[PDB]
Write a protein that binds this ligand. Structure first.
Ligand SMILES: O=C(O)Cc1c[nH]c2ccccc12
Ligand SMILES: O=C(O)Cc1c[nH]c2ccccc12
Lengths: 104, 105
C-alpha cells in the first residue's frame, strides 16, 4: 500500500521518537550516565543480544569462522548470518570502513 | 564466588561483550556514525521500542498522563507501567534526576 497521510504522520513521529532516544543516549555518554541509562532502557537479554551481534558482525567481516562455527560459538544460524550480512552490505561505506578499522 | 564456575564464565564473557558494544557505540557517536551503527545493530521494531520506552519513562516522571492514556497512546498496560516504574526506582538517583532535567525541560 502507498503511504497515506495517516501512516506518514505516524512514521515521522516514530522517527522523531527514535532520534530523541539517540540524542538522550549521546548526552548520557557525555555525562558518564550511559551505563545506567542502558540498564534502564534495555532488558538483560536485549543487552546480551547487542553484545553477541557485535561478535557476529566482527566475525562476518573477518571471514575466518565457518557457518558451523558461527552457529556453535555465537548461536548465529544460517538465517541470522544472512540477515547480518545484508545489514552489513546495506550499511554506508563510512560505517563499514570504520568497523573494519576498529573490530579487526 | 557468587556463581559457580560455568555460570561465572558465561557471565564474564557476556560482560566483556557488553563493554565492547558500549565502547563501539561511544566511539561511533564521536565519529558521527551512531545512526548507521544503531541501524546495523538494532532491528526496526527494537528501535521503535526504544523510542517508546523513552516516552514511557518521560510520562512516568512527569506524572500527568493517566493509566488509560499510557495504554492508549504508548501501548503500556498495567504490567508494563509497573515494570518501568520498578526500573526507575532501581536506577541510581543521579540518573533519575538527570532524566528529569533532560526529558522534562
Ligand atoms: O536479525 C536479527 O535477528 C537481529 C540482528 C540485528 N542486527 C544484527 C546484526 C548481526 C546479526 C543479527 C542482527
Ligand atoms: O519491560 C519492558 O517491557 C521493556 C522495558 C525496558 N525498559 C523500559 C522502560 C519503560 C518501559 C518499558 C521498558
Amino acid at each position: 500500500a502507498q503511504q497515506s497521510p495517516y501512516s506518514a504522520a505516524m512514521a515521522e513521529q516514530r522517527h522523531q521518537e527514535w532520534l530523541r532516544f539517540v540524542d538522550l543516549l549521546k548526552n548520557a555518554y557525555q555525562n558518564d550516565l550511559h551505563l545506567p541509562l542502558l540498564n534502564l532502557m534495555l532488558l538483560p537479554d536485549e543487552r546480551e543480544a547487542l553484545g553477541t551481534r557485535v561478535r557476529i558482525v566482527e566475525e562476518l567481516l573477518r571471514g575466518e569462522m565457518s557457518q558451523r562455527e558461527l552457529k556453535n560459538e555465537l548461536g548465529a544460524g544460517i538465517a541470522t548470518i544472512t540477515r547480518g550480512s545484508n545489514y552489513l552490505k546495506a550499511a554506508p561505506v563510512e560505517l563499514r570502513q570504520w568497523l573494519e578499522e576498529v573490530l579487526l
